[PDB]
Design a protein around this ligand. Structure first.
Ligand SMILES: CO[C@H]1CC[C@@H]2C[C@H]1[C@@H](OC)CN2S(C)(=O)=O
Length: 281
């Protein structure tokens, strides 16, 4: 059981050690499309690339590339699109991807500015009456409503395909309180946030995959998907304690590199799953 494995790693201070074995065992697949010179300005970080096999393709004939990966968790019956925070030049591609994949929710785990630098373009409208038009992808985005709470904001948005005049409602879940350095002290508000996303229906098989991002789409974004998938597997299985976090993380890492960036994020993921298991047993 992970709770006892947790106390062992904690009492022995072996988190950096566990973390390094995960780094060592992690899959390495080609990412040739990401490295083409015509895609250099579509990547926020030169060392964070989607694998070719799992990359999301845009349905535009010119250049189909976006820094985004499909993570397919077969046993849990959950999919997630993990992507980078959009760049000034990729905001239109981001919303095209949301449209094309039939996503119902966007999960944002960063602030636009952290540590005095911009981690993400402002890719949604700040006021009802000031909508955004993405001329490159022929989409219009309107803020419908915004509910600001202490640890997160939920926004209703309307996305309109200007080409076909179809509209969809998108939910934007913005976790606003992740600290600039380290991880939250308690996983309580993160779990509350994850249960709010689940309650919305955004993670349900009726819809396309949820879009999850932070700045790189690997660290906080990884913690989100890893906690959700582990808790779902504990509900589904005859024996809940057969769930090995390290194995689930490695299975996820076949689909996108570098998920869980620090030993701190790994420790936090264990804590979130252990605590969430109480609210699920
Ligand atoms: C990064 O913050 C935490 C993460 C977990 C702990 C303590 C500390 C790390 O020290 C930088 C080392 N690990 S540890 C002892 O398990 O190797």
């Amino acid at each position: 059981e992970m709770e006892k494995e947790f106390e062992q790693i904690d009492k022995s201070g072996s988190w950096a050690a566990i973390y390094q074995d995960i780094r060592h065992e992690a899959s390495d697949f080609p990412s040739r499309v990401a490295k083409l010179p015509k895609n250099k300005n579509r990547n926020r970080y030169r060392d964070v690339s989607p694998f070719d096999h799992s990359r999301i393709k845009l349905h535009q004939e010119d250049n189909d590339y976006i820094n985004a990966s499909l993570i397919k968790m077969e046993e849990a019956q959950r999919s997630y699109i993990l992507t980078q925070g959009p760049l000034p030049n990729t905001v239109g591609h981001f919303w095209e991807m949301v449209w094309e994949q039939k996503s119902r929710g966007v999960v944002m785990l960063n602030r636009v500015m952290e540590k005095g630098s911009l981690k993400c373009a402002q890719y949604w409208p700040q006021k009802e009456e000031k909508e955004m038009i993405f001329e490159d992808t022929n989409l219009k985005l309107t803020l419908i409503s915004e509910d600001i709470k202490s640890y997160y904001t939920v926004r209703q948005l309307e996305l309109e395909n200007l080409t076909t005049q179809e509209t969809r409602e998108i939910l934007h879940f913005h976790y606003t309180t992740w600290p600039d350095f380290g991880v939250p002290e308690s996983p309580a508000s993160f779990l509350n946030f994850l249960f709010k996303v689940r309650e919305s229906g955004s993670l349900s098989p009726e819809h396309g995959p949820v879009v999850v991002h932070c700045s790189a789409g690997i660290g906080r974004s990884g913690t989100f998907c890893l906690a959700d998938t582990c808790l779902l597997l504990m509900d589904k299985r005859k024996d809940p304690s057969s769930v090995d976090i390290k194995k689930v993380l490695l299975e996820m890492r076949k689909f996108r590199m570098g998920l869980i960036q620090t030993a701190d994020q790994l420790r936090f993921s264990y804590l979130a799953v252990i605590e969430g298991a109480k609210f699920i047993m």
